[PDB]
Curated annotation (Swiss-Prot):
Biased composition annotated in UniProt, kind: Basic and acidic residues: 121-137
Highest classification ranks of the organism: Bacteria, Bacillati, Bacillota, Bacilli, Bacillales
Full protein stretch here: 83 to 231 of 231
Cellular localization per UniProt: Secreted
Region feature Disordered, mapped onto this chain: 121-149
Name of the molecule in the record: Nuclease A
Binding site for Ca(2+): D21, D40, T41
Domain of life: Bacteria
Active-site feature positions: R35, E43, R87
Length: 149
C-alpha cells in the first residue's frame, strides 16, 4: 500500500472535552472542537431518573483517555474538514490508539452513518463493532441464555 503512506498525523493538545463525540482540542494554535468521525454516542439526558444503562461511560473514557494520553494526534480525512456547526470532522489518536476505534471496540459507541467520501477507516470500524458484539460488552451484553428456548 503506497510507499510510505499518504496520510500523516499532526500534534495537538487537550483543551476541554464535553461529550463522548464532542471534544475540544488545541490545534493550529487555536481552540477547535472535534467530532469523532464515523462515531455515534448515546444520549445521557433522555432519562431524568439517571441513566442505568451507560450514560456517564463514553464521556468518562473520553476525558480519561484524552487527559492521560500525553501523545494526542489528530488526522483529518480527505473528506470535508468542518461540519455545518464548526465541528472538526476527523479521527483522534490517544497514545497512538484510534480513540474512535477504542470507544467502538469497547461497546460504548456505534459507527455513525457512513457518507462518502468520508470512508477511510470504515471497514476497520466495522471489525471493531463486530468484536464488541461478539464479546457482549456493555450494550452487547443483552443475551440472557438463548440456549434452546
Amino acid at each position: 500500500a503506497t510507499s510510505t503512506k499518504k496520510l500523516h498525523k499532526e500534534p495537538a493538545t487537550l483543551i476541554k472535552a464535553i461529550d463522548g463525540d464532542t471534544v475540544k482540542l488545541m490545534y493550529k494554535g487555536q481552540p477547535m472542537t472535534f467530532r469523532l468521525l464515523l462515531v455515534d454516542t448515546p444520549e445521557t439526558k433522555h432519562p431524568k431518573k439517571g441513566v442505568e444503562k451507560y450514560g456517564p461511560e463514553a464521556s468518562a473514557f473520553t476525558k480519561k483517555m484524552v487527559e492521560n494520553a500525553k501523545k494526542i494526534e489528530v488526522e483529518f480525512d480527505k473528506g470535508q474538514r468542518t461540519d455545518k456547526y464548526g465541528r472538526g470532522l476527523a479521527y483522534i489518536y490517544a497514545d497512538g490508539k484510534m480513540v474512535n476505534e477504542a470507544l467502538v471496540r469497547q461497546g460504548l459507541a456505534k459507527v455513525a452513518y457512513v457518507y462518502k467520501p468520508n470512508n477511510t477507516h470504515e471497514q476497520l470500524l466495522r471489525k471493531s463493532e463486530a468484536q464488541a458484539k461478539k464479546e457482549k460488552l456493555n450494550i452487547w451484553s443483552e443475551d440472557n441464555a438463548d440456549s434452546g428456548q
